[PDB]
Amino acid sequence: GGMLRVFILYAENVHTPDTDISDAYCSAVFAGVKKRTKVIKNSVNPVWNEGFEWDLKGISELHVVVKDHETMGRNRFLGEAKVPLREVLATPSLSASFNAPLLDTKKQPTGASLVLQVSYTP
Amino acid sequence: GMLRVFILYAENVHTPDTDISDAYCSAVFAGVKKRTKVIKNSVNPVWNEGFEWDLKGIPLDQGSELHVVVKDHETMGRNRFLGEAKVPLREVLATPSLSASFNAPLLDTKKQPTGASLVLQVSYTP
Numbered sequence: 001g002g003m004l005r006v007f008i009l010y011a012e013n014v015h016t017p018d019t020d021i022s023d024a025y026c027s028a029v030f031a032g033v034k035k036r037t038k039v040i041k042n043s044v045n046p047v048w049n050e051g052f053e054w055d056l057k058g059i060s061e062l063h064v065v066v067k068d069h070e071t072m073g074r075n076r077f078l079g080e081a082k083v084p085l086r087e088v089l090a091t092p093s094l095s096a097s098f099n100a101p102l103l104d105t106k107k108q109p110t111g112a113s114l115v116l117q118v119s120y121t122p
Numbered sequence: 123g124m125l126r127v128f129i130l131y132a133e134n135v136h137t138p139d140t141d142i143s144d145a146y147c148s149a150v151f152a153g154v155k156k157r158t159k160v161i162k163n164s165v166n167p168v169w170n171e172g173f174e175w176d177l178k179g180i181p182l183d184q185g186s187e188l189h190v191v192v193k194d195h196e197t198m199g200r201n202r203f204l205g206e207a208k209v210p211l212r213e214v215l216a217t218p219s220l221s222a223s224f225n226a227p228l229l230d231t232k233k234q235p236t237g238a239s240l241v242l243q244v245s246y247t248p
């Protein structure tokens with residue numbers, strides 16, 4: 001009964017904490033429901049082009065976390081951003097484009113950016 | 123025999139972000155894990171902590187290293203690995219006094235130098 005369609009397009013300047021080349025994926029959570037992209041192996045500028053659909057069960061910010069896949073182990077945090085969906089309700093098309101600067105554990109910009117398009121079907 | 127490793131300090135240990143390292147140092151020998159206290163907000167943490175392993179006749183597999191790992195303590199998420207180094211105790215302890223000082227260069231997740239180093243003292247009492 002209603003839908004949130006989030007297309008995660010790409011990221012730029014995604015750098016890990018060492019000599020490893022970013023194995024980046026995004027974990028996005030809307031209304032407590034989490035969706036995660038595939039891992040782009042060995043890229044500092046990952047292109048996912050992955051579309052997602054949050055079934056709005058008849059009912060605001062989108063929280064996206066970018067992590068580095070760790071070759072058999074616990075993935076490491078690279079950066080995160082919160083995007084307000086109010087601006088999505090703003091334009092008549094019920095959709096908007098976002099260029100999100102990734103923030104660190106201390107909420108400071110890491111220098112990486114995530115580009116995603118949101119859309120609402122009431 | 124008693125294996126006593128004194129962890130003095132680390133130098134140039136940095137987190138991946140604006141966080142100033144809240145470093146602690148784990149040390150593992152023969153499946154026995156030891157861990158220092160956490161030094162808040164220092165890229166050159168000093169622990170000055172001593173640990174002991176009673177060998178007590180546990181398999182002395184020919185080559186058996188001390189595995190040291192330095193991590194950054196986190197309050198909102200998982201602790202972050204900063205650097206790890208493998209100390210060859212047989213080679214370092216090969217002195218008349220059965221004691222030595224070792225500067226272990228810390229390695230990253232891909233086995234490449236991080237530029238950080240851990241200073242320690244090792245000794246074994248027959």
Ligand SMILES: [Ca+2]
Pocket residue numbers: 020021022023041042
């Ligand atoms: Ca990689």
Ligand SMILES: [Ca+2]
Pocket residue numbers: 020021022023068069070071
């Ligand atoms: Ca990785």
Ligand SMILES: [Ca+2]
Pocket residue numbers: 141142143144162163164
């Ligand atoms: Ca800190």
Ligand SMILES: [Ca+2]
Pocket residue numbers: 141142143144194195196197
């Ligand atoms: Ca920390």
